[PDB]
Amino acid sequence: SRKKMGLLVMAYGTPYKEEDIERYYTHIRRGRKPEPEMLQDLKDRYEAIGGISPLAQITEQQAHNLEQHLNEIQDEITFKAYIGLKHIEPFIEDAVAEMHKDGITEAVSIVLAPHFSTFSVQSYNKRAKEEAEKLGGLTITSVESWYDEPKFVTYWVDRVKETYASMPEDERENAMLIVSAHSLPEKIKEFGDPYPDQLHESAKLIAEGAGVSEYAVGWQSEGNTPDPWLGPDVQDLTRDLFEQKGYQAFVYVPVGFVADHLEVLYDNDYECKVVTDDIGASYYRPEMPNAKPEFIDALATVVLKKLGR
């Protein structure tokens, strides 16, 4: 009775083992192999955050729990998850070819990043669709953004409320909430890319829901292309706000990220923590969504809304 549909779950990708780091960052750096000192530094960072292998496992669990949950909560469609990644196998093109090979004719896609950008989401969506077109007989409907899904907002609102409630009274009245996403080159503005506006809306929605009146928006994890990247960076922002108003606690919500990956476990929990430690402020960073049931239900809702179900 049920209609079969592919569920294409797309993400940046993460290395699967230490020996993957070289090829992974080469791919990110557009063919430019990192120098030996950069490779060793990267290996050290991954060791510092508890190792590499749990990273890719999170994406796999998110895709599979999403598949199973979608299949449980409605009775019209049977979904089959396929993971397509940007910077490591299985690549996006590989996943589409496999759906096509398995006889899938209709699919829905979603990127594991809630905010639309021309650089990331649009590019993944275009690549998926071009491959489907090249093969023929397979169509894909693509989710473009989902930062504004109530259930996803609620996830972060609830985590923020819990954090502020755990604070001693003096920190609670002198805390600052920093809401962030991965920086992109500023030149996306040339196309009217709504990515920065969507991060600001994410921050508004989360702060409002949590009852937090003092918050700011920052960016993190900028690459090293020559042209300017979106700022301010979370490290500079933290220090600027501290020098400005003397906050005693900083709460970091990297809403652009969905998992315990390097850019959270290192770029927040180490790099921002260095700054808060230096200024004598408390550091808080609530749990990332990962594959938790509340997050999986939000993602399932997004997918079913996109399909008009």
- With respect to Cl ion, which residue has the nearer C-beta, 42 or 143? 143
Enter the tokens of residue 261. 């990956």
Is the distance from CB of 283 to CB of 167 less than 8 angstroms? no
Q: Which residue is nearest to Cl ion (CB)?
A: 145
Is the distance from CB of 119 to CB of 184 less than 8 angstroms? yes
Which contacts of 229-233 are long-range, i.e. CB under 8 A and separated by 24 or more positions?
A: 229/183, 229/184, 229/185, 229/186, 230/183, 230/184, 230/185, 230/186, 230/188, 230/196, 231/183, 233/183
Determine whether the annotation assigns residue 46 to a binding site.
yes
Q: Which residue is nearest to Co ion (CB)?
A: 221
58 HSE (CA, 13 A, CB side): 22
Return the one option of Cl ion, Co ion, none that residue 143 interacts with (CB less than 5 to 8 A, by type): Cl ion
Distance CA 201, CA 189 (A): 17
Which residues within the stretch 102-121 sit at the binding site for Cl ion (CB under 5 A)? 116
Determine whether the annotation assigns residue 215 to a binding site.
no
Smallest gap from residue 306 Cβ to Cl ion (A): 6
Return the one option of Cl ion, Co ion, none that residue 180 interacts with (CB less than 5 to 8 A, by type): none
Contacts with Co ion, 160-199, as mask; x by CB under 5 A = ----------------------------------------
Distance CA 282, CA 204 (A): 23
Smallest gap from residue 125 Cβ to Co ion (A): 19
- With respect to Cl ion, which residue has the nearer C-beta, 24 or 147? 147
What is the helix (H) or strand (E) element at residue 9, kind and residue range? Answer: strand 3-11
* Binding range to Co ion, per CB under 5 A, among 37-45, 92-100, 166-174, 217-225: 217-225
* Binding range to Co ion, per CB under 5 A, among 38-46, 70-78, 109-117, 213-221: 213-221
Interacting residue with Co ion among 221, 238, 248, 301 (CB under 5 A): 221
Determine whether the annotation assigns residue 89 to a binding site.
no
Is the distance from CB of 254 to CB of 266 less than 8 angstroms? no
Q: Is 143 in the site for Cl ion (CB under 5 A)?
A: yes
Interacting residues with Co ion (CB under 5 A)? 221
**Would you tell me which residues interact with Cl ion (CB under 5 A)?**
116, 143-145
